[PDB]
Amino acid sequence: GMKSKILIFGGTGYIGNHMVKGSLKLGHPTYVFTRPNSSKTTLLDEFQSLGAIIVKGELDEHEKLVELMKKVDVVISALAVPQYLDQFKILEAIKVAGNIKRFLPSDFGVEEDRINALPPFEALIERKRMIRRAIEEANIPYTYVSANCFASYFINYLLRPYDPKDEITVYGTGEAKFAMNYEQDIGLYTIKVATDPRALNRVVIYRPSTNIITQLELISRWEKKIGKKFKKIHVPEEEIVALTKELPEPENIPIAILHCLFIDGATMSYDFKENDVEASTLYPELKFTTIDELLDIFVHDPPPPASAAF
Numbered sequence: 001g002m003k004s005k006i007l008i009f010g011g012t013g014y015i016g017n018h019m020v021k022g023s024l025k026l027g028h029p030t031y032v033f034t035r036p037n038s039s040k041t042t043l044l045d046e047f048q049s050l051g052a053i054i055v056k057g058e059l060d061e062h063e064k065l066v067e068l069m070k071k072v073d074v075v076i077s078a079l080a081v082p083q084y085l086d087q088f089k090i091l092e093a094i095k096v097a098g099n100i101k102r103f104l105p106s107d108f109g110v111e112e113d114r115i116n117a118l119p120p121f122e123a124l125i126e127r128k129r130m131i132r133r134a135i136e137e138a139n140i141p142y143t144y145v146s147a148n149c150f151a152s153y154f155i156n157y158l159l160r161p162y163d164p165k166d167e168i169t170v171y172g173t174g175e176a177k178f179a180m181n182y183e184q185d186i187g188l189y190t191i192k193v194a195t196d197p198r199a200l201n202r203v204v205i206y207r208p209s210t211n212i213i214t215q216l217e218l219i220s221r222w223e224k225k226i227g228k229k230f231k232k233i234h235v236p237e238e239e240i241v242a243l244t245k246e247l248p249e250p251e252n253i254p255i256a257i258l259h260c261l262f263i264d265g266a267t268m269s270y271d272f273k274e275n276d277v278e279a280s281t282l283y284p285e286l287k288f289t290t291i292d293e294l295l296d297i298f299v300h301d302p303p304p305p306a307s308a309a310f
């Protein structure tokens, strides 16, 4: 009834599917824009069975976007890095429609307006900021979400639980702190704040105290969980730096993220600004799945590994 109608772009995506599910679970009328040449047919069928309205089309269909924007209240973009400036197509429709109550561009990472990485990653951040400036310039109501590290994503990446190897690779010293959150919670919380007046025109950061850790600490705890000690092999920072300069694109981009995440610890290298909102504090009936709980999940039923597109 009163439920805001939510439109999600990139809904079949890695993090996008969680926003679609949390939206439906929260009883929000949910529209999912997806490409006709969709290969996520089985996932779309699932969304459909959950009550979601599927809208096939291309971002180039400006008029379709405009007429669609008119039927919804909230717009969330969970598009991949390759499609970042394409968000200007979504932005143009919103502007023409004029009725959008909240717009969440595709961030869901580190806090771009307060951290600096190597040229490769610095370039992608610059783009996100371009989007942000355009949003504020037009006075479009928004919410900037810094979700920090996708947990299942990085546990698979750093621990390779689907590989009984005796060694484990540590980037840099492994002493750098970072925060990692379960993908399911990132989705649910993003939907909550997209309608939370407390997040209107604000930067929301997902940093629950129970999800801050270093590579070494993560490894050490995984070891206790499974009762197996691993041989640690470090990759010097200087080597990671050289690679970002040598390796081509997009190969060198995740190399720059790794340095920024696990070597620089850009997800913990800053203190909260006055206007910042840390989401775990917003809802007493909700909580982020903790690291220990996450390790438990990877023991009882580990989720499959995944790689982001660059």
Ligand SMILES: NC(=O)c1ccc[n+]([C@@H]2O[C@H](COP(=O)([O-])OP(=O)(O)OC[C@H]3O[C@@H](n4cnc5c(N)ncnc54)[C@H](OP(=O)(O)O)[C@@H]3O)[C@@H](O)[C@H]2O)c1
Pocket (backbone or CB within 6 Å): 009, 010, 011, 012, 013, 014, 015, 016, 033, 034, 035, 038, 039, 040, 059, 078, 079, 080, 081, 083, 106, 107, 108, 109, 110, 147, 148, 149, 150, 153, 307, 308, 309
């Ligand atoms: N913080 C972290 O640890 C972390 C990790 C990974 C990603 N991220 C961030 O999360 C956001 C989304 O990442 P993601 O990996 O979830 O995205 P993704 O799964 O790679 O892609 C999202 C969706 O984009 C649509 N799409 C793909 N190619 C397209 C094209 N050429 N034109 C139009 N639409 C296209 C697809 O949907 P359809 O097939 O339905 O059209 C796809 O499912 C990004 O901003 C990314 O940087 C953060």
